[PDB]
């Protein structure tokens, strides 16, 4: 059901790392005004790892309050402990989130059956639309297409964020699912392709700085207009690359800082974008017409 450009919103912070509430509010309003179709609160780009339990909740509550039902809000509720994921997901349901996004448990490397049981348990514990999220390079585990297809059979699992950036594999997943659940790109570089091939949207990092342009890219790609999709994506294509010169969200938070939208706060172990990457980033933003 949720389709289009789905921004993986950063969590603005003060210089001392405290959550920058006013700046977050402005961002949410700007996204809605700019055409962003949905927001993922407190996901990887939002530094879920370094926010406390209370902050995780405050941020979700704030984004929901400011969005005021204008666009669906997806809450990042993944954890590498099934017990904890259930807790976070329930909190999200209770706060009024429209769906929850759950990255596969990271670092502890569960088996494929373990991943199946992990998500099955959460789906059965919380009546809320759940989106799976696979990003092996970060987690140490790869949720296979086969496992994803099995999970698509479970009530409440309505989709998967495929951040592999492996298009053939993504197309294979889409074809095997045959509409059973949605597929979202989790790789800005190839998102336009995956959507042309059947993905329902892009849970984007780039949409953080070019929400209007990415909104348009998703729209025409979903419409299966290959020429337009390719033409519009080319305009923001270098951005998809430069926003990962250092681990996301380091570059994207700096980009927004250069845009005058947020301050420099970011929590250890993450660090402000290294100096050698700032000019190139500023150039890229000027080139794409952002600043």
Is 50 labelled as part of a ligand binding site? no
Q: Does 189 bind a copy of itself (CB under 8 A)?
A: no
Is 63 labelled as part of a ligand binding site? no
Catalytic residue list: 133, 161
Which window, 68-76, 125-133, 242-250, 281-289, contacts a copy of itself (CB under 8 A)? Answer: 242-250
Is 80 labelled as part of a ligand binding site? no
Total residues contacting a copy of itself (rule CB under 8 A)?
Answer: 35
Q: Which two tokens stand for residue 104?
A: 């596969």
Which CB, 71 or 143, lies closer to a copy of itself? 143
Is 104 labelled as part of a ligand binding site? yes
Q: Does 264 bind a copy of itself (CB under 8 A)?
A: no
Contacts of 83 (CB under 8 A, 6+ apart): none
Instruction: Indicate which single residue of 121, 149, 290, 291 sits in contact with a copy of itself (rule: CB under 8 A).
Output: 121
- CA 132, 170, 188: angle at the middle one, nearest 5? 80
E strand map for the chain = 4-8, 38-41, 73-76, 99-103, 130-134, 157-162, 182-185, 201-204
User: How far apart are the C-alpha atoms of 190 and 7, rounded to whole Å?
Assistant: 16
Which CB, 235 or 278, lies closer to a copy of itself? 278
Contact between 159 and 170 (Cβ < 8 Å): no
Which window, 33-41, 45-53, 178-186, 282-290, contacts a copy of itself (CB under 8 A)? Answer: 45-53
Pattern 139-158, binding to a copy of itself, x per CB under 8 A? xx------------------
DSSP-derived 3-state class of residue 182: strand
Q: Does 90 bind a copy of itself (CB under 8 A)?
A: no
Q: Which neighbouring-strand residues pair with 40?
A: 8, 74
Quick one: three-class SS letters along 66-133?
Answer: HHCCCCCEEEECCCCCHHHHHHHHHHHHHHCCCEEEEECCCCCCCCHHHHHHHHHHHHHHCCCCEEEE
Which CB, 171 or 277, lies closer to a copy of itself? 277
Q: Whole-number minimum distance, CB 119 to a copy of itself, in Å?
A: 9
Instruction: Indicate which single residue of 16, 22, 54, 107 sits in contact with a copy of itself (rule: CB under 8 A).
Output: 107
Contact between 11 and 46 (Cβ < 8 Å): yes
In the DSSP assignment, the letter for residue 218 is H
Which window, 77-85, 88-96, 209-217, 233-241, contacts a copy of itself (CB under 8 A)? Answer: 77-85
> Which residues lie near a copy of itself (CB under 8 A)?
44, 47, 49-50, 80-83, 103, 105-111, 113-115, 117-118, 121, 137-140, 246-247, 250, 267-271, 274
Query: Which residues carry a binding-site annotation for Mg(2+)?
Result: 104
């Amino acid at each position: 059901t949720i389709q289009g450009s789905i921004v993986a919103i950063v969590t603005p912070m003060l210089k001392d790392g405290g959550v920058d509430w006013k700046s977050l509010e402005k961002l949410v309003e700007w996204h809605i005004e700019q055409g962003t179709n949905s927001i993922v609160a407190v996901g990887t780009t939002g530094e879920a790892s370094t926010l406390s339990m209370e902050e995780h909740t405050q941020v979700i509550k704030e984004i929901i309050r400011v969005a005021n039902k204008r666009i669906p809000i997806i809450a990042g509720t993944g954890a590498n402990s099934t017990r904890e994921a259930i807790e976070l997901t329930k909190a999200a349901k209770d706060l009024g989130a429209d769906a929850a996004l759950l990255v596969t448990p990271y670092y502890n490397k569960p088996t494929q059956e373990g991943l199946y049981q992990h998500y099955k348990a959460i789906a059965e514990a919380v009546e809320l639309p759940l989106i799976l999220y696979n990003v092996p390079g970060r987690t140490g585990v790869d949720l296979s297409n086969d496992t994803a297809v099995r999970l698509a059979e479970i009530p409440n699992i309505v989709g998967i964020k495929d951040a592999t950036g492996d298009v053939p594999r993504g197309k294979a997943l889409i074809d095997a699912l045959n509409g059973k659940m949605a597929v979202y790109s989790g790789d800005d570089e190839t998102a336009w392709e995956l959507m042309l091939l059947g993905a329902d949207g892009n849970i984007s990092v780039t949409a953080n700085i070019a929400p209007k342009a990415m909104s348009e890219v998703c729209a025409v790609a979903i419409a299966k207009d290959e020429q337009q999709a390719k033409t519009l994506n080319n305009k923001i294509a270098n951005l998809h690359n430069i926003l990962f010169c250092e681990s996301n969200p380091i570059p994207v938070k700096w980009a927004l800082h250069e845009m005058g939208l947020i301050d420099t706060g970011i929590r250890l172990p993450l660090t402000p974008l290294a100096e050698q990457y700032r000019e190139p980033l500023r150039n890229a933003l000027k080139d794409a017409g952002i600043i």
